[PDB]
Amino acid sequence: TGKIVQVIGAVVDVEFPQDAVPRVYDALEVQNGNERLVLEVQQQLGGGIVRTIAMGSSDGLRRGLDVKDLEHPIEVPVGKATLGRIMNVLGEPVDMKGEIGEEER
Amino acid sequence: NSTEISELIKQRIAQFNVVSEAHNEGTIVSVSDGVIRIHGLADCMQGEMISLPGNRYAIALNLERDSVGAVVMGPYADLAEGM
Amino acid sequence: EFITVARPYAKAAFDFAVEHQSVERWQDMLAFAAEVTKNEQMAELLSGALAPETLAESFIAVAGEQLDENGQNLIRVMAENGRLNALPDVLEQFIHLRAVSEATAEVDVISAAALSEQQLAKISAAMEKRLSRKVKLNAKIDKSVMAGVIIRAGDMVIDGSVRGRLERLADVL
Structure with missing residues (x-):
């Protein structure tokens, strides 16, 4: 549903359609290589961007990966x-x- | 060409059905750590209470240009863009 | 004020317009965009927190008289950076850049009354020797000068007005 647009160390920025932006503590999922990485969203920026913290190792993340919106914390x-x-x-x-x-x- | 292009622009903009915000209203565009940014709200006053969905309130502290910065007086993690 | 943000975009637009022999069309395209930037409703949209892509599309729509190369690319690149309010300056810089390559100067003249068109042609031919450009005079009728003329050639100015000489004398005392 959304896509990674930045990766700064432990924090990740994800872009969603403005009609589907997650809430401010929801979990998100990314396929990091072959593993599954969970992000917890910390902030809602404008434009549908959302800042999250990666519950796992951040290495290997490309920008442009697809992320899946789990609609629960x-x-x-x-x-x-x-x-x-x-x-x-x-x-x-x-x-x-x-x-x-x-x-x- | 100036007048015809200007009125062409007014025609075309109105034709694309954009509508401007009403004074006394706005929309949340950012949410973080208890502070929210509101777009619109031209008639906000410094220190004024503004009402959020639910029965929550915020205090308008920053009357900048292009945005109002306000502080939520309660649990804020339910707010989201576009409210 | 965003002269400094407009410099790169103006330079890129101009340096592209000479690769495709269409400076004259680009100038009016940018002039159209600079006018759309001023509308009271569009200026409300540009301030809001729309996504750069949809905000760019909401700007392409109000201007169909644009090249594929010009609008649908320049406006999108400026939207990604949120620079669209800079359009009124990206125009002027562009004009300026053109006048540089075309070896032209927009000398301005100010006077208390119209000049005889012999005075004015002499001014043209004399400035073209002072400078090294084809000048393009435009006059202004300002009464406070009372007599004589001011010649402004950018940051250089030559003041021959009787008021300037009067208030210089007032400080000679």
């Missing part, structure tokens, strides 16, 4: 299911065990 598993386990900042499991069995995020 970052969400993490929660509750009993998450007790004896190690988790990423994105709520992903980081120990080598299987997926987390949460019912709620």
Whole structure:
């Protein structure tokens, strides 16, 4: 839906149609090479531009990549299911065990 | 040529259905860290309260040219361009 | 004021117009754009935070009398940079650049009353010797001069008015 137009280190600028600009804490997704990178939008500039922080390594990002608008903030598993386990900042499991069995995020 | 080109321009601009902002209204064009920039709002006064969608308000502090800079008096992360 | 932002665009437009032998058409194209920049409604649009691409398209539409090379490219490049309000100056610089290559000077003359067309032709031929250009005089009838004439040739000026000599005498005292 949108496209990268700048990459300054950890921050990324993304351009969207003005009728579809994301809100100010939504998550976005980019295919960085072969991996999947999540951006969290921090600011809405004019013209439909949006400034985001990359929840991952920023190297390898070209400007002009397509980005996908997830219409919800970052969400993490929660509750009993998450007790004896190690988790990423994105709520992903980081120990080598299987997926987390949460019912709620 | 001056008068005919000028009135041609008025004709063509009106023909492309552009409409100017009403005084006493504006549109949000930027949102960040609690400060919003508003385009329009020609009759804003320094320190005046302006009403946002919902029942929220902002204080117009910067009456620049081409923009008003205002501070949101509450949770701001719901605001967006074009409101 | 944006002389400094208009210099590159004027130089590029002119240096392109001589590669395609159409300086005379480019001048009037830029003059049309400079006039559209002034309208009260268009000046409202140019201030708003539209996307550069759609704001450029909303400007192409009001001017169809433009080349593919000229409008649909120059206006878009200026829109990407947000420079469209500079158009009234990009025109003047362009004119100036032309007058330089064509070895011309727009000498201005000021007088209390009309000159005899022998005085004025002598002025033309004499300035063309003072300078090294074809001059193009234009006169002004300013009464405060009272007698004599002011010749302005850019930043150079020659003052022969009786008021100038009077107020110089007033400071000789």
